[PDB]
Design a protein around this nucleic acid. Structure first.
Ligand SMILES: [Mg+2]
Ligand SMILES: [Mg+2]
Ligand SMILES: [Mg+2]
Ligand SMILES: [Mg+2]
Ligand SMILES: [Mg+2]
Ligand SMILES: [Mg+2]
Ligand SMILES: [Mg+2]
Ligand SMILES: [Mg+2]
Ligand SMILES: [Mg+2]
Ligand SMILES: [Mg+2]
Ligand SMILES: [Mg+2]
Ligand SMILES: [Mg+2]
Ligand SMILES: [Mg+2]
Ligand SMILES: [Mg+2]
Ligand SMILES: [Mg+2]
Ligand SMILES: [Mg+2]
Ligand SMILES: [Mg+2]
Ligand SMILES: [Mg+2]
Ligand SMILES: [Mg+2]
Ligand SMILES: [Mg+2]
Ligand SMILES: [Mg+2]
Ligand SMILES: [Mg+2]
Ligand SMILES: [Mg+2]
Ligand SMILES: [Mg+2]
Ligand SMILES: [Mg+2]
Ligand SMILES: [Mg+2]
Ligand SMILES: [Mg+2]
Ligand SMILES: [Mg+2]
Ligand SMILES: [Mg+2]
Ligand SMILES: [Mg+2]
Ligand SMILES: [Mg+2]
Ligand SMILES: [Mg+2]
Ligand SMILES: [Mg+2]
Ligand SMILES: [Mg+2]
Lengths: 117, 155
RNA sequence: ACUGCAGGGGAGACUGGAAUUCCUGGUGUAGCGGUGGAAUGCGCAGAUAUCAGGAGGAACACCGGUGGCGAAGGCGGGUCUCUGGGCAGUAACUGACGCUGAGGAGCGAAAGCGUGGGGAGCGAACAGGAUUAGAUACCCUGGUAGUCCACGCCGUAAACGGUGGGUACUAGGUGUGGGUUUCCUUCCUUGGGAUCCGUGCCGUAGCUAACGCAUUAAGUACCCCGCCUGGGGAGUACGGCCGCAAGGCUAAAACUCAAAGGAAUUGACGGGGGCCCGCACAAGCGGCGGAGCAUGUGGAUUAAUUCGAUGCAACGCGAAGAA
């Protein structure tokens, strides 16, 4: 029942999952449909195909609240990072600008130990 | 094999029905070298197909094959600790091969009495999209369209 | 001593921003998380996500390097206060005051110890999930000591250049850090030449068992120091000294073996790499494994079941003829 003409889309793309939420310019969530919401479970969530179905289920549910143009903030070292920007385009959204806001610490907190796999 | 592709064999037109598609059908029915027997099965079935449609039966047979050609098969691969199928696009000469194997392959276990009328009814149902050979056209497609996520494993 | 110069060398106080975590609140709603694949776990009592505000601790992205500093251990966010050492130039001053150093004394990563603060993240122990024949492990989700600060103790590292310190000498090539100084010199090029001090790579003589070292020597010589005398037993015992403890330092013998080692060579092997083949797999068609019979074999039986063949490469094999 809302109507905001311009929005912002946040894509967090990790090594296990992708999550595409779409907000207003103040930072209030309209729709958030991710790769587990679209039916997947396990290691399938990290594939590029599950990213281009997560970005569609957030795009055509943001349009029911009237969102016609989003900005794109991607972050994360994931596979599904270009296939979720190209998937917002072929669902009826103008993308405008694309920015990278990956949280880069200035050698602060200590990382977990490396895996002996 | 290791050293490049192998040559494929040419097929001569069938003398009764002027079609390469019919002489490729009689080779799938062929068992134990009995080729005159395998020609009486295929000729006897296509003449039982114009006793129920009236149209020339190589028009029925080309419509029967266009409903059992797959376009995405399901070739397998083991990646790590788990193995899972990978969908690949079928090149056009395999599509006719895999379709004619399915007509002859499912007509050997239908419930009629002779191989002539079993092969005849499978061509008529596949031309209408009814038989069991059409069911493996979409069971191939359902398994290929439930593994879209694995399409980056193209070897 | 004077004059210049380079630097994460040290100690103290105040202080800066990104991010991780939790808290308060808004928007939002059904999954998040994790893996080779999963589950435990978190969530539906409103998580993850997303924006705003706040609390707190630790570490300091880019600069940052093959580079600088320090006796070694080590040392980088910023500024201020105190402070150690080195290099070059001048040749002003003292006039062998030099080198090494048995015992001794100080300093000495991390873990650990004592009392007192602090506790974000990580994380010995521990708990659960997984894997597995088992899994007191690797992997996953949690998590205490500890990591941090103040003050003491401990005194050990593959504390490494596996190479003690001082000095003199013995071809060069080429990078780079810190100075000083003549020439086309202000045509800027901060290029070239010379010279002193570091820090690398490559290389002749020379040395070495070989690998390798080579003006930063493992070369040619001199001076002082510690150490070695076959491998185990053993850097263990006993005695002593030190420590709050853990333990450290000094340090044997009986007994036992005929070796233990170093560098390199040829092979083979690798759940190492590169390229290449084969009905090796894949893509196909027909079988064997279940039935009945023929035949050979193991075993058992028998007076005897004659002998030989035993993973591929024995088993319709020696037998192309056992009444
Ligand atoms: Mg300093
Ligand atoms: Mg202090
Ligand atoms: Mg902050
Ligand atoms: Mg907290
Ligand atoms: Mg909240
Ligand atoms: Mg939050
Ligand atoms: Mg500082
Ligand atoms: Mg005098
Ligand atoms: Mg001395
Ligand atoms: Mg001494
Ligand atoms: Mg001390
Ligand atoms: Mg410590
Ligand atoms: Mg203890
Ligand atoms: Mg303590
Ligand atoms: Mg304490
Ligand atoms: Mg753990
Ligand atoms: Mg356990
Ligand atoms: Mg020692
Ligand atoms: Mg060291
Ligand atoms: Mg030593
Ligand atoms: Mg010497
Ligand atoms: Mg030099
Ligand atoms: Mg060399
Ligand atoms: Mg020597
Ligand atoms: Mg001895
Ligand atoms: Mg001892
Ligand atoms: Mg004692
Ligand atoms: Mg050796
Ligand atoms: Mg060898
Ligand atoms: Mg090999
Ligand atoms: Mg095969
Ligand atoms: Mg059998
Ligand atoms: Mg025998
Ligand atoms: Mg044979």
């Amino acid at each position: 029942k809302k109507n905001v003409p311009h929005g912002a889309a946040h894509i967090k793309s990790t090594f296990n999952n992708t999550i595409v939420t779409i907000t207003d310019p103040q930072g209030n969530v309209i729709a958030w449909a991710s790769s587990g919401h679209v039916g997947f479970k396990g290691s399938r969530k990290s594939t590029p195909f599950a990213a281009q179905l997560a970005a569609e289920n957030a795009a055509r549910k943001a349009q029911d609240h009237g969102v016609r143009k989003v900005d794109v903030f991607v972050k994360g070292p994931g596979s599904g990072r270009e296939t979720a920007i190209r998937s917002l385009q072929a669902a009826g959204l103008e993308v405008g600008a694309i920015s990278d806001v990956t949280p880069q610490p200035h050698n602060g907190v200590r990382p977990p130990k490396r895996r002996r796999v | 094999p290791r050293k490049g592709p192998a040559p494929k064999r040419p097929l001569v037109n069938d003398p009764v029905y002027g079609s390469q598609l019919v002489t490729q059908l009689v080779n799938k029915v062929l068992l134990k070298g009995k080729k005159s027997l395998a020609e009486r099965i295929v000729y006897g079935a296509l003449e039982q197909a114009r006793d129920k449609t009236g149209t020339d039966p190589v028009i029925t047979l080309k419509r029967a094959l266009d409903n059992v050609k797959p376009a995405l098969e399901v070739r397998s691969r083991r990646v790590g600790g788990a193995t899972y199928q990978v969908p690949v696009e079928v090149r056009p000469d395999r599509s006719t091969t895999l379709a004619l194997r399915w007509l002859v392959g499912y007509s050997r276990q239908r419930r009629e009495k002779t191989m002539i009328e079993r092969l005849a009814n499978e061509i008529l149902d596949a031309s209408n999209g009814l038989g069991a050979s059409v069911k493996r056209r979409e069971d191939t497609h359902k398994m290929a369209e439930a593994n879209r996520a694995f399409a980056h494993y193209r070897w």
